[PDB]
Amino acid sequence: RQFGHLTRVRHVITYSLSPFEQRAFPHYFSKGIPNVLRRTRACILRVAPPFVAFYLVYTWGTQEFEKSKRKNPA
Amino acid sequence: IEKERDVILQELQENDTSMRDVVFNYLHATAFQGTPLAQSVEGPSENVRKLSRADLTEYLSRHYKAPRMVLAAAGGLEHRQLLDLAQKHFSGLSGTYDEDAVPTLSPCRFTGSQICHREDGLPLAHVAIAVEGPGWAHPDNVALQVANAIIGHYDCTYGG
Q1: Most A CBs within 10 Å: which of B111, B120, B124, as the mutation test of the A interface?
Q2: What residue ranges define each of the domains in chain A, with the CATH number in brackets?
Q3: CB B22 within 8 A of CB B15
Q4: Nearest CA of chain A to the CA of B6: how many Å?
Q5: Beta-carbon neighbour count of residue B141 at 10 Å?
Q6: Taking a contact as any Cβ pair under 8 Å apart, which residues of chain B between 79 and 118 contact chain A?
């Protein structure tokens, strides 16, 4: 497979520029970092909470393990 | 003015079919983007439905000026059959201007950029590529016309 018989396009226009005629990293700090946040807010809720719970079962799993080795009053 | 304002909007429809001339109108539109030179000749359909007599009058009243005009002819005549006749007829022309009315040129820069009107439904694909040219005065045009001649041309009929 290759270019030439993939599929159909009609009445679409493309505007593209050389790289030499433009900076490589325009608005890297300005527009990116707000876009990092918006990128972040849209994933954080359904990514962490499992890993959040993991921090607790890595927490309680060791604490409850430590106690079991300490003697009892008997 | 109103009739031609319809005729113009009949030929923009035609030049869509003059696929070759669409390319150069795209080519000039890119490499010379941002300048007046990216403009078409007949103009967009929008401005043609908005152009006034005064814009013509103002456009006309600035560029048609003797220092930036020429007359020429050849074949069957003598140069002094002619000089009298512009001395006769064109002597009344506005050979001057309001001091700040006649502008000179901006150096039109050059861009390296691609433009593509993707259209798979049509028979063939008209394509063009080019670079910055030197200009009129620069003598190496006599060089480059050779190089193009070295490469040349072909269209589906030459028996070679």
Answers
A1: B120
A2: 1-74 (1.20.5.210)
A3: yes
A4: 25
A5: 13
A6: 111-118
